[PDB]
Design a protein around this ligand. Structure first.
Ligand SMILES: CC(C)(C)C1=NN(c2nc3ccc(Cl)cc3s2)C(=O)C1
Ligand SMILES: [Mg+2]
Length: 456
């Protein structure tokens, strides 16, 4: 019938914020279940709308100027359509390298802005997602033998894709370079740690993860997470205390390697304050069951593994005993999580849309742009009419009437304040001095100046 496939992908963007910065380029290729390429590379650009200037640092990294994306790209509506078409092919595992924390948020935001369901793509038609970054971290932590693990310039293990490829003799340039490097990482771990690879892949599924969670017993688990830090191989033992009171997919864990005294001694208001500035640190963290967290039974990390990572196993066991004897900590941590921006681009997580609103937004999607002004349609959620105006003005500006044109002009004036444009110019001048010896970067910075001069 339909074959299971992987769709490896990567974005280049114009900045670090997945909602407020705009995408520049999307790259993807599909493989079979054994990581052999199927079909052709998909690479395309996104034209940025005229209400945005790129972050100069992002352009220095990607080498993609706003002029290039504008001249070679389609509008974000069309960009979104192409990506949505790829991501909704049945039985696809959509994956990348740091996609769970970055690329997937870019995707959610692109879909949100352009009237696609931000979530359905990842689970409908037997689809799933995965991320090779925490696979590499898990391999280093749990089963490192066979792979060369590079250090960064601070002397800690690095999981930068370019460091891992070089360290392991993998060729890594080409818009497809990061995608091909990600495929190489997948092959590396599958070949060299086959049982761990299979375990991690199987446990991408929320139900397999949920089966590991035993809140009444505070059953300990090994967890590998970038939040723990490279200095301990991104690893600790954790115990589940309670599920999040609002977020259906988040469990509240305690880091057993931490100091649990604040949890025993302080009240939830105090605990909440410390947790959100980031004097002992509050050893609580959320694990999101749909974000392919790395979790395994506690004995997966053996004493000799803990020793290698510098983790104090007996301290963790001691803390687990104390927590089990203090079940009032559960209500405390729940109370912590029981508990600003007027830019609709920043409002993806203000709430889920109702079925009625989703049905209305589908009509918007399936209507010709020229016919949108006459569309007799109503929305409940207050984000949607704002999303719709921006959608039309950014993508289909020739369909705006005089009044709408004036509204868009005002929008642009509020973005391009004299203080914003001055700071932008100042940043460019600073970077040209910093990179004066790198003539290609100097050329990129000059391109950014020229674009700002035009778009203003
Ligand atoms: C002896 C062997 C197999 C390594 C085991 N280690 N182990 C556990 N190690 C830890 C380490 C930390 C914690 Cl919090 C719980 C456990 S349970 C077992 O239950 C059995
Ligand atoms: Mg990337």
């Amino acid at each position: 019938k339909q074959q299971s496939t992987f769709l490896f992908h990567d974005y280049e963007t114009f900045g670090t914020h997945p909602a407020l910065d705009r995408p520049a380029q999307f790259a993807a290729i599909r493989t079979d279940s054994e990581f052999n390429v199927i079909g052709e590379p998909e690479v395309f650009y996104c034209k940025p709308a005229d209400d945005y200037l790129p972050q100069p640092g992002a352009v220095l990294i990607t080498g993609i100027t706003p002029q290039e994306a504008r001249a070679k790209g389609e509008n974000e509506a069309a960009f979104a359509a192409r990506i949505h078409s790829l991501f909704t092919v049945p039985k696809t595992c959509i994956l990348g390298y740091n996609n769970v924390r970055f690329d997937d948020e870019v995707t959610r935001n692109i879909f949100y802005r352009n009237f696609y369901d931000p979530y359905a793509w990842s689970w409908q038609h037997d689809n799933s997602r995965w991320d090779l970054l925490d696979v590499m971290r898990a391999c280093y932590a749990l089963r490192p033998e066979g792979i060369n693990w590079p250090e960064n310039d601070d002397g800690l293990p690095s999981f930068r894709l370019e460091h891992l490829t070089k360290a392991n003799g993998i060729e890594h340039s080409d818009a497809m370079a990061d995608v091909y490097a990600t495929i190489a990482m997948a092959k590396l771990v599958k070949t060299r740690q086959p049982r761990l690879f299979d375990y991690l892949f199987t446990h991408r599924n929320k139900h397999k993860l949920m089966a590991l969670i035993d809140v009444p017993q505070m059953k300990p688990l090994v967890h590998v997470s970038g939040m723990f830090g490279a200095w301990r191989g991104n690893t600790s033992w954790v115990a589940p205390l309670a599920w999040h009171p609002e977020n259906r997919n988040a469990v509240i864990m305690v880091d057993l390697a931490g100091d649990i005294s604040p949890l025993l001694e302080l009240d939830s208001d105090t605990l909440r304050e410390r947790l959100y500035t980031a004097n002992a640190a509050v050893p609580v963290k959320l694990v999101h069951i749909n974000k392919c967290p790395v979790l395994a039974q506690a004995n997966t990390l053996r004493p000799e593994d803990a020793d290698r990572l510098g983790i104090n196993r007996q301290h963790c066991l001691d803390n687990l005993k104390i927590l089990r004897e203090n079940p009032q900590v559960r209500e405390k941590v729940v109370a912590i999580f029981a508990e600003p921006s007027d830019n609709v681009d920043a409002q993806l997580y203000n709430g889920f849309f109702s079925d009625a609103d989703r049905a209305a937004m589908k009509i918007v999607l399936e209507t010709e742009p020229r016919n949108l002004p006459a569309l007799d349609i109503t929305f409940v959620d207050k984000r949607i009419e704002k999303l719709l105006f921006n959608y039309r003005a950014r993508n289909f500006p020739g369909t705006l009437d005089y009044a709408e044109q004036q509204r868009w002009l005002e929008h642009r004036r509020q973005v391009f304040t004299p203080e914003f444009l001055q700071g932008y110019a100042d940043e460019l001048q600073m970077l040209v001095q910093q990179y004066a010896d790198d003539k290609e970067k100097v050329a990129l910075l000059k391109a950014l100046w020229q674009y700002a001069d035009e778009i203003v």
